[PDB]
Amino acid sequence: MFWDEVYRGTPPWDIDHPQPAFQALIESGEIRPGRALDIGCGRGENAIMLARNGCDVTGIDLARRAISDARAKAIERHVKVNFIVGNVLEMDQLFTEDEFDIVIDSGLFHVITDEERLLFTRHVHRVLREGGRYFMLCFSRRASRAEIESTFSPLFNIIYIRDVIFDSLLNPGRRQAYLLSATR
Numbered sequence: 746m747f748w749d750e751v752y753r754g755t756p757p758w759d760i761d762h763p764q765p766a767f768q769a770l771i772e773s774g775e776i777r778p779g780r781a782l783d784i785g786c787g788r789g790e791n792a793i794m795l796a797r798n799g800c801d802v803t804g805i806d807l808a809r810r811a812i813s814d815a816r817a818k819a820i821e822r823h824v825k826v827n828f829i830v831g832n833v834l835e836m837d838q839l840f841t842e843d844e845f846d847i848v849i850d851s852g853l854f855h856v857i858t859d860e861e862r863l864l865f866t867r868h869v870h871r872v873l874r875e876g877g878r879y880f881m882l883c884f885s886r887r888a889s890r891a892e893i894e895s896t897f898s899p900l901f902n903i904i905y906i907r908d909v910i911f912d913s914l915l916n917p918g919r920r921q922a923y924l925l926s927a928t929r
């Protein structure tokens with residue numbers, strides 16, 4: 746399966762630290778610690794950072810190798826995180842509605858197929874608590890912001906879309922990104 750193949754190596758988003766956009770949300774107090782879900786969590790850096798800052802954290806990813814490596818990191822860093830193999834489009838089998846204070850999405854929405862985009866937003870909306878926060882980080886230009894807005898505004902109250910930086914292993918390193926903050 747494609748995502749098993751990418752985690753045979755180190756893809757360009759697979760940095761050795763959490764994304765600064767999410768870490769800044771924690772360090773500024775914009776996010777208050779709570780029950781958090783990291784969808785498409787990859788090798789777990791953002792989920793582990795959330796857990797080290799007092800969140801009760803679950804991470805889900807399709808790729809068993811990413812989940813296994815994420816568990817290894819959690820053990821290495823003496824942090825408790827529930828890392829599970831699973832499909833975000835089947836979360837009605839894994840989580841309840843209204844369960845999570847925080848859902849973070851670091852590059853998952855970016856790779857959801859256009860056919861499944863509406864189903865994706867419904868699953869995310871379902872597991873977010875009333876008044877919870879969905880944070881979605883993706884690559885940015887002008888139409889990138891317009892499609893984020895059109896995709897999420899039916900189901901979510903959009904709080905903001907913010908220009909931020911994204912760390913990567915690419916040869917410019919720091920790239921341009923958009924951060925969506927939204928509630929239900």
Ligand SMILES: Nc1ncnc2c1ncn2[C@@H]1O[C@H](CSCC[C@H](N)C(=O)O)[C@@H](O)[C@H]1O
Binds near residue numbers: 784785791834853856
């Ligand atoms: N339907 C799906 N359900 C759960 N995870 C998925 C998925 N489709 C793709 N993914 C996962 O989504 C991730 C996007 S890459 C982002 C990885 C991680 N959040 C990071 O910032 O490093 C990949 O790890 C991929 O395996």
